[PDB]
């Protein structure tokens, strides 16, 4: 499915994912597309933070869902 990844400033991408896809898996995907290292990404959905072991289906994340990325500095 598609899910939206927005920085707090508002720069947005989509990803093609599957609901049982770990956040570590999706952080690896966000690096493949954008060059942002996993541990420079703090991910948030429905006002909770997202965890590396858990799945999208453990947060109820469905098609065209917006997650929120906290990025301090591009290239930092």
């Amino acid at each position: 499915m598609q899910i939206f990844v927005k920085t707090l400033t508002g720069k947005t991408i989509t990803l093609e994912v599957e609901p049982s896809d770990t956040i570590e898996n999706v952080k690896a995907k966000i690096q493949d597309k954008e060059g942002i290292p996993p541990d420079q990404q703090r991910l948030i959905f429905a006002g909770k933070q997202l965890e590396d072991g858990r799945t999208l289906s453990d947060y109820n994340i469905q098609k065209e869902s917006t997650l929120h990325l906290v990025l301090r500095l591009r290239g930092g």
Partner: protein, 308 residues
């Protein structure tokens, strides 16, 4: 918008001993996996998150819990002091005082305490066990320094007091004291730099209001949104990525439209664009107290703010 030189001298020592120093609870031994929860020294996520960034091949350690975050809260506690005084009936804490009752001396003591609030971090780890351990370290770092150099300013009752605030004990109220209330409310504003609009405007549960609703409920919509725009100007001044705001997007963030409409009746409409992080401003803020302080004093406080 002016801080006592004895406050900045305490922030000089803190930056050298704690905020400059790397994150030491990190690496493989502090990784976490729920599935194997006690296969590591970590009992929860977050130990390896944003440990440093690189500006001109220089490390900016604990960037999100660093010098710019720590010193921005002092300006917020100095603004809310006047904001509280404008209220007929400011919130009255468990000790029986309001922030408005605080004198100019207590605020200088409260500013010195705010410096060690997150200074005891060893990582971005956020689970209560890491959070309460790190707050305990910052508290003991305060106690030692305060007992040794600041007896001319603090009484032994006040070190006990301010250490208890920084600790944020399990079984102490939010506003248990008018100093700790304000220290929390200062810490809180600055969360705007790392939180989704939900936790900022909707609140992260049905109970909890949301950061800006808190500023509006306590200080009024006018004073309450002045305080928010100033927090976001101070983000800009310290090279932080200023978030955008959009009341049109709140319905599509996976919440029940009760808590959106509640936030919409309270916040009102807010549309306002975000601004992108600057390596140069961030580094100026992050690597010296002089550069942090200088970058932040330049920024206009609202029209009603007149320091005593």
């Amino acid at each position: 918008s002016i801080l006592d030189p004895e406050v900045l001298k305490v922030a000089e020592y803190v930056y050298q001993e704690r905020l400059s120093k790397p994150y030491t609870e990190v690496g493989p031994e502090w990784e976490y996996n729920h599935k194997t929860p006690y296969a590591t020294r970590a009992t929860g996520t977050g130990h390896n998150l944003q440990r440093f960034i690189t500006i001109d091949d220089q490390r900016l350690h604990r960037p999100i819990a660093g010098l710019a975050h720590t010193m921005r809260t002092l300006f917020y506690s100095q603004l809310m002091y006047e904001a509280a005084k404008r209220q007929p009936h400011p919130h009255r804490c468990a000790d029986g005082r309001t922030i408005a009752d605080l004198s100019v001396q207590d605020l200088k003591k409260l500013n010195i305490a705010q410096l060690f609030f997150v200074a005891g971090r060893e990582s971005e780890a956020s689970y209560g066990d890491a959070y309460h351990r790190y707050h305990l370290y910052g508290a003991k770092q305060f106690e030692a320094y305060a007992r040794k150099h600041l007896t001319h300013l603090f009484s032994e009752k006040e070190i006990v007091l301010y250490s208890r605030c920084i600790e944020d004990r399990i079984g102490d109220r939010f506003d248990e004291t008018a100093e700790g209330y304000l220290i929390h409310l200062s810490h809180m504003i600055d969360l705007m730099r790392c939180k989704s609009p939900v936790e900022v405007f909707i609140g992260h549960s049905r109970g909890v209001s949301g950061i800006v609703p808190t500023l509006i409920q306590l200080f009024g919509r006018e004073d309450g949104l002045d305080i928010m725009h100033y927090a976001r100007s101070l983000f800009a001044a310290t090279g932080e990525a200023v978030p955008y705001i959009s009341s049109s997007e709140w319905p599509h963030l996976g919440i029940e439209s009760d808590r959106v409409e509640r936030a919409l009746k309270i916040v009102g409409s807010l549309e306002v664009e975000g601004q992108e992080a600057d390596a140069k401003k961030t580094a100026q803020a992050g690597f010296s107290v002089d550069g942090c302080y200088g970058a932040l004093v330049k920024i206009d406080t609202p029209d009603w703010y007149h320091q005593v």
